[PDB]
């Protein structure tokens, strides 16, 4: 977890992949709008 000094890349990575999922999916949902 925390300790001396570093940067938590675990959440910055999972956070951006949640975003890649949104942009990807919403991107399809627009291009297939019924």
């Amino acid at each position: 977890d925390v300790d001396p000094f570093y940067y938590d890349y675990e959440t910055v990575r999972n956070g951006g992949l949640i975003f890649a999922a949104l942009a990807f999916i919403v991107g399809l949902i627009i291009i297939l709008s019924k």
């Binding site: 940067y7 992949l17 890649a20 942009a23 919403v26 627009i30 291009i31």
Partner: protein, 994 residues
């Protein structure tokens, strides 16, 4: 030298057989035809008159062409050297990188996805375009069983007799039984398009040279012929040739030429950089293998792979839109050209008009007479018994040549279907409803000779046997351009009694034409001459090629005028057209009065502008006294165009806003076009008749009426309005303007990226700082932002200003011009680049290296051995440790470009309006924006992306670094375009309107 020897090899004919012989061979009566029975019989025996389908290409092979389609093929080259270099990496090092393995994978992949995409689109065009190849059932006129009927050409068999006229396509190989001055177009066969005459005479032992054989796939220009079918379907001389009777051809559209020119130079510079960078990299101690991969990445980057696919979509789009508008377009690229139109020269009768005429007034006995124009239920408004009307209607019937088709004499006269001039049709239908049987009238006066009507003579004429008692034994009859007709007369018929044409009557004839013609009615003059007996004995040999009989001194009988109303759409058609900056000129072989009238009625001429005749008449002074420039509109009689120098014709074009050319010859219709082109315009001719042929060919775009148009004129054009809907021209012109914008938009966007894709490596040398952006990341820029978003612009809907802005100048608004390089390179390409640079400095300074410190580090930052790299804070970095930051800087710079590419892809959606007027209704653009960034999130935030492509995760703060710059683009262009909306001709526009 030719191959005509290798064509007369397999010949064998009956151009030698006598008429009796010819008769007994095929068994058909040379005058009554063959019974419909015997026809149906032979049809099932021989099979339809249609060449059997020649397979052009197979599916999968067409797939591969697309897969190696120009830009696609170079992509393989790079993709090959990417796999190639990876093979070498496993020989110079122990377990090397995974970069070039994955790089060849992605590159190749792109070619495939692009390839099979472009394929499918281009397949969809050739599906829809071919759905129209069989929508015009080429008709043919056959005289089966005495009567004559028009049937599908497929139903024509060997044996029956065909009747071709002027502008008719010859439906099968014929032996000419009969002809009056017929001329065929043997161009498709013998090169030279000069009209060869067909008579029934056997002229040359070779079937090709001889005059009495008319071939299938040629068309008869003018004159008339009856031939008998000697070869159906694949058996014809032109089916026998195994080359290409219908399909692939030539011609290279201007839009295509513009593109091909651009691609030649853009690919030029794009390889100039690659190899200049390739050697520069080598100089800069770049490894040998990653120098070629640096080059190959550069090349891909300054070459717009999308363009092709984009173009393909744009056509596939337009071909779908014209289709729903019943508009056969022979070449899809040409719809572009139809946008670039400044000048439409249109034909009058059967184009702007419906060609459905109905007789409305006659002028005879110095009086004007009405005849019941709609729902007649009676005949005319005069005594059917009048001696003069008798003499008129006799020749309106006699000099007529139109006839009802087969099996019609059982239904009402209006209800039956005809065969011939729309003018003649009206004459026929008129007198058949109110006087007698033209059938019987014509049979009573057996016709000895005739010169059938043609667009240039502007009169018809025939000598008939007379069976009366006050009969002088031969009756000449003729009709035509009423002016022309009148000038040929000495006497006029009045209450039966002919008496010399004094001046008074002439001027009453002229007020008549003004009156009648001024209603926009079409007028024909009618006269006869009773050929005197001592000069014309019984068995007299009337000649019709050297005129054995009088053409002058006839007795003018009368005038008959027919209603011929403008086609529904035509006003708003020419309305919208002018409103888009297109000049509409009427060009007609009709009388000036009739012409001007319609010209005002459809709005070629606006009631408020005057002609010099209009002005002169106002001030009661000579017409030749008015200063021609005081006139905005004019009506130019072709009799005077005959005495025009080019300069004079030029000047009338140059200085007149609304022009009309009356009584023009076929050729004159070309001269005018030729004139309007000499000025530097792009002209459109809309035709119908076969007199429209030569203009239609000369025109930058021909447009035939798909119904009332002739075979030969539809063949000349690049457009065939199958629904005869004239409004389709607008739908076409808009569409064409749209291909141009969306194709320019696409090039605007795809070109920005180049500057940032190359400025890093340039600066890497000029300031010796760590490389802000490298090979792996450049590819991502390109194949990530410069692909889908580029093609998305093809799917981008029309602007709102297109049919309200002047037509493009072909010698200024080139598809790519300096102003377009000004923006993509000098303005928007620069900003985007600065966006990447900014974030680059932010990451380094945040990681310890303030920009000012960064100068010089290049040599040692790149150096594999110095691991004491002292930043600004004095910290010490190892090699790979600072490289992690460098390559994190790469991943950000790329991601930054993605952010600015949104704004650019937004401003490159509209060239004039704002993006709030235009609106996000292009869903494929939105789609492009999301996946483009999802991808950019993915490449940075996916595990092993820094081990495979040197791409490492971003810290949240990074994404926004580019935001200020992205907004800067949106607003610079938004206001840039706003200044142009509100300052036309203004400096802004004249420099930044690409």
């Amino acid at each position: 030298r030719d191959m005509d020897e290798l064509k007369k090899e397999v010949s064998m004919d009956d151009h030698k057989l006598s008429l009796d012989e010819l008769h007994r061979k095929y068994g058909t009566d040379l005058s009554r035809g063959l019974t419909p029975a015997r026809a149906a019989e032979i049809l099932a025996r021989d099979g339809p008159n249609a060449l059997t389908p020649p397979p052009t290409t197979p599916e999968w092979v067409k797939f591969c062409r697309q897969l190696f389609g120009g830009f696609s093929m170079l992509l393989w080259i790079g993709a090959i050297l990417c796999f190639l270099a990876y093979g070498i990496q496993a020989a110079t090092e122990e377990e090397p990188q995974n970069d070039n393995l994955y790089l060849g994978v992605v590159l190749s992949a792109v070619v495939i996805i692009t390839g099979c995409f472009s394929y499918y689109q281009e397949a969809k065009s050739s599906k829809i375009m071919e759905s129209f190849k069989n929508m015009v059932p080429q008709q043919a006129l056959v005289i089966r069983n005495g009567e004559k009927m028009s049937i599908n050409a497929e139903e024509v068999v060997v044996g029956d007799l065909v009747e071709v006229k002027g502008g008719d396509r010859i439906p099968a190989d014929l032996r000419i039984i009969s002809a009056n001055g017929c001329k065929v177009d043997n161009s498709s066969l013998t090169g030279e398009s000069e009209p060869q005459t067909r008579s029934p005479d056997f002229t040359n032992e070779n079937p090709l040279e001889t005059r009495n054989i008319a071939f299938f796939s040629t068309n008869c220009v003018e004159g008339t012929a009856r031939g008998i079918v000697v070869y159906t379907g694949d058996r014809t001389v032109m089916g026998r040739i195994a080359t290409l009777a219908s399909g692939l051809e030539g011609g290279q559209t201007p839009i295509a030429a513009e593109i091909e020119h651009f691609i030649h130079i853009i690919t030029g510079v794009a390889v100039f950089l690659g190899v200049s960078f390739f050697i520069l990299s080598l100089i800069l101690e770049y490894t040998w293998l990653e120098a070629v991969i640096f080059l190959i990445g550069i090349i891909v980057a300054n070459v717009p792979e999308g363009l092709l696919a984009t173009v393909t979509v744009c056509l596939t789009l337009t071909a779908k839109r014209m289709a729903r508008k019943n508009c056969l377009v022979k070449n899809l690229e040409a719809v572009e050209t139809l946008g670039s139109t400044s000048t439409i020269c249109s034909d009058k009768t059967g184009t702007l008009t419906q060609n459905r005429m109905t007789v409305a007034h006659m002028w005879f006995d110095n009086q004007i007479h009405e005849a019941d124009t709609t729902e007649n239920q009676s005949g005319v408004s005069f005594d059917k018994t009048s001696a003069t009307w008798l003499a008129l209607s006799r020749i309106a019937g006699l000099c007529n040549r139109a006839v009802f088709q087969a099996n019609q004499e059982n239904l009402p006269i209006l209800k039956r279907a005809v065969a011939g001039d729309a003018s003649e049709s009206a004459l026929l239908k008129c007198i058949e409803l109110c006087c007698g049987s033209v059938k019987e009238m014509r049979e009573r006066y057996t016709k000895i000779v005739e010169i059938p009507f043609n667009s240039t003579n502007k009169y018809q004429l025939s000598i008939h046997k007379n069976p009366n008692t006050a009969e002088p034994r031969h009756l000449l009859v003729m009709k035509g351009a009423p002016e022309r007709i009148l000038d040929r007369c000495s006497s006029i018929l009045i209450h039966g009694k002919e008496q010399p044409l004094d001046e008074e009557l002439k001027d009453a004839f002229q007020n008549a034409y003004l009156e009648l013609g001024g209603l926009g009615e079409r007028v024909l003059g009618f006269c006869h001459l009773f050929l005197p007996d001592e000069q014309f004995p019984e068995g007299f040999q009337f000649d019709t090629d050297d005129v054995n009989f009088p053409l002058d001194n006839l007795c003018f009988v009368g005038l008959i005028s027919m209603i011929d109303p403008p086609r529904a759409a035509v006003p708003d058609a020419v309305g919208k057209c002018r409103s888009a900056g297109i000049k509409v000129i009427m060009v007609t072989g009709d009388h000036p009065i009739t012409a001007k009238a319609i010209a005002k009625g459809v709005g070629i001429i606006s009631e408020g502008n005057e002609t010099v005749e209009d002005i002169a008449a106002r001030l009661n002074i000579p017409v030749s006294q008015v200063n021609p420039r005081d006139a905005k509109a004019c009506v130019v009689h072709g009799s005077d165009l005959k005495d025009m120098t080019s300069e004079q014709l030029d000047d009338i074009l140059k200085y007149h806003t609304e022009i009309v050319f009356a009584r023009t010859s076929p050729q004159q219709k070309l001269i005018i076009v030729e004139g309007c082109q000499r000025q530097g315009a792009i002209v459109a001719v809309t035709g119908d008749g076969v007199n429209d042929s030569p203009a239609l060919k000369k025109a930058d775009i021909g447009v035939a009426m798909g119904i009332a148009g002739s075979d030969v004129s539809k063949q000349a054009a690049d457009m065939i309005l199958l629904d005869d809907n004239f409004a389709s021209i607008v739908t076409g012109v808009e569409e064409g303007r749209l291909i141009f914008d969306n194709l320019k938009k696409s090039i605007a966007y795809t070109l920005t990226s180049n500057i940032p894709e190359i400025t890093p490596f340039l600066i890497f040398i000029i300031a010796n700082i760590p490389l802000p952006l490298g090979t792996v990341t450049i590819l991502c820029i390109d194949l990530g932002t410069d692909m889908v978003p580029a093609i998305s612009l093809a799917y981008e809907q029309a602007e709102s200003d297109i049919m309200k802005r002047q037509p493009r100048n072909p010698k200024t608004d080139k598809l790519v011009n300096e102003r377009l390089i000004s923006m993509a390179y000098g303005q928007i390409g620069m900003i985007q680049a600065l966006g990447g640079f900014f974030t680059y400095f932010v990451i380094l300074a945040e990681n310890g290296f303030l920009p000012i410190h960064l100068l010089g580090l290049r040599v040692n930052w790149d150096d594999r051995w110095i691991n004491d790299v002292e930043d600004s804070y004095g910290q010490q970095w190892t090699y790979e440790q600072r490289k992690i930051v460098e390559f994190t800087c790469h991943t950000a710079f790329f991601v930054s470009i993605v952010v600015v590419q949104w704004a650019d892809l937004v401003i490159c959606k509209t060239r004039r309006n704002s993006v709030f007027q235009q609106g996000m209704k292009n869903k494929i653009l939105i789609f492009g924006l999301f996946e483009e960034t999802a991808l950019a999130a993915f490449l940075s935030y996916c595990p092993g992306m820094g081990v495979a492509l040197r791409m490492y995760p971003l810290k949240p703060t990074w994404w926004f670094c580019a935001f200020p710059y992205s907004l800067l683009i949106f607003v610079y262009d938004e206001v840039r375009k706003l200044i142009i909306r509100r300052r036309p001709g203004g400096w802004v526009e004249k420099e930044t309107y690409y």
